[model samples]
Target: NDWEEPRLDIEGFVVDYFTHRIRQNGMEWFGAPGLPSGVQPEHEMMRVMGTIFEKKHAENFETFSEQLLAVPRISFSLYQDVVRTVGNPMSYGRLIGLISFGGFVAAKMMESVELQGQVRNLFVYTSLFIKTRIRNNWKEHNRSWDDFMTLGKQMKEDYERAEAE
Candidate 1:
């Protein structure tokens, strides 16, 4: 029902990101770098995100992977907006999970385990510990981090002082 919408949005974002990459590279695996003759798209995603809970979920990955690929790619801008809209300070844990998952995918794509671990740890720890406060002045909660950083020094000092205690 309504609770499932956020997960759907996340699934859509992942599929869209991969689809965008697939098209930009002309539907060819970068590892092979030639034709569409190598592993299927889902397999490639797994290979890239192998560090994900893939090993733990292998029992159903076969089925899940197929279902995941079945979801069509969404427009990049639309997906970005969905991610923004769905994000909330209370549910920030999911945001950290999303970012770490995406980082793993990216690191895998670039063939760098070092970067994957680094990105995962960075997102998990920083986001997990640092709570984001929504400003009342902003009429829109979906604004980017750039907007948040524009807060005056007084506001930052107030927040910092409270956080210190």
Candidate 2:
């Protein structure tokens, strides 16, 4: 029943990603200081995420892990879509645009606060998954830290312009 390459369980992948980091680095993994020492793409990504997490979550490693693990499972099709999109070779602009567009559509469709929260959590988890892959295989993908940052700024501006329209 199994093939050469098994289908990845997104939930399991995410759970292990955070857990492994916490187990090795302890609470220091969640702390924001000294995260920007390297010029690598992962370093920049973690620095930004660290600042945001510190400001918004501000929970201990154990509590953060609990909250992450508590998020409800996302749909199978969506998980497959996420894996396909991130696995392929694509420009950062295209990738971020696709993600933002999907998030906007998902947000618009949700009628209840609970549903909206679930979608938000799913997006957060998916972003983490993508970032982890990028960190692990940036050289293979030919990704540059500057390119990501530049595209991210452009994406932000595009969203603001759309909001103003």
Candidate 3:
């Protein structure tokens, strides 16, 4: 009822990037300012990828970042489905409260659908997307546009060169 499953899913996502790197590979820790209110340096994925890529192939940070970010969204969709079905009305009271809150958010959110992709494009250039990528990277998959920039800084990078805006 407290959204613990999704929250824990996000927490595990953030921590897992370091599962092999720090716990098994012995790399030092890093930090992510884009996490929940109480996360710490021990959760850093940036430093992990940095060290692994640097040592293995002299890979550019961008190159490794691109691949890291490009991971599929399978976990995200799976988590969403699991969360919705995890419990059968865990708390009638809490469910009512959520329904009340969601109605409010939905009323406000509907006003933006007319903007096409404007909402995404405009706000993306902000620090928010950086955090979004970080969170999604940690919460889900970081395979996003930022990865392309990371790859742009790499040698023989694909660029996935686009044909239009």
Candidate 4:
């Protein structure tokens, strides 16, 4: 059991380091920075909404991380295109409906409280990830808050559609 003591010490150190890094740099490193000040319900909604497609389609946590890390690489041109084509008014009620449906699926699958909490964290992380990207490009295209909502709505639809096919 003496040898096990050293192993435990090393494991403890590693876990502490991991936790510290996540706390210090997780959001920015994960490409999910906090939104700028002054945005009202949109900021809150983005973090609250569940990403059902990712939860259902990813084979496991590793796959999910892989998918998430790729979000930042989404082309500015694509953002431009979405803004151009999906300029219709965003329906808040419909967005809430979609979010609730996703949340239901997530709740059903993640029975453990620990797992549920982690899943919710991931969902918020994902929302912030996209939010950061949108914020970064917002000024470039001279886009407005409405454009942000439209892009978000269209992206959700696209994800759902992709899962279906």
Best by TM-score: 2
Q: Write the per-residue lDDT of candidate 2 for residues 29-116, one digit (tens) a residue.
A: 2211221222334333433333333333333323332333343455634554544533124455334333433333233324444443
Residue 42, model 1: Cα distance from true site in angstroms: 33
Choose 1 or 4, whichever is better by lDDT.
Answer: 4
lDDT of 1 at 51: 27
- lDDT tens per residue, model 4, 38-108: 33445333433334422443244333233333443333443233222111222333333223332332333
What are the lDDT figures for the candidates, one per model?
0.34, 0.39, 0.29, 0.36
Q: Report how far residue 9 has shifted in candidate 4, in Å.
A: 42
Provide the RMSD of all predictions against the true structure, rounded to 1 decimal. 16.4, 13.2, 19.1, 17.5
TM-score of each: 0.22, 0.37, 0.20, 0.28
Q: How high is the lDDT of residue 45 in model 2? A: 42
Point out where model 1 deviates above 4 Å. 1-75, 78-90, 111-165
Residue-level lDDT of model 3, residues 1-165, one tens digit each, is 122334333343233333223333333223322345444332233333333333433333233233322433213333233224211322322222222222122222223334222212212222222233344343343233234235424422222232121
Best by lDDT: 2
Clashes of each: 0, 0, 4, 0
lDDT of 4 at 144: 51
Model 1 weakest lDDT span, ten residues long: 1-10
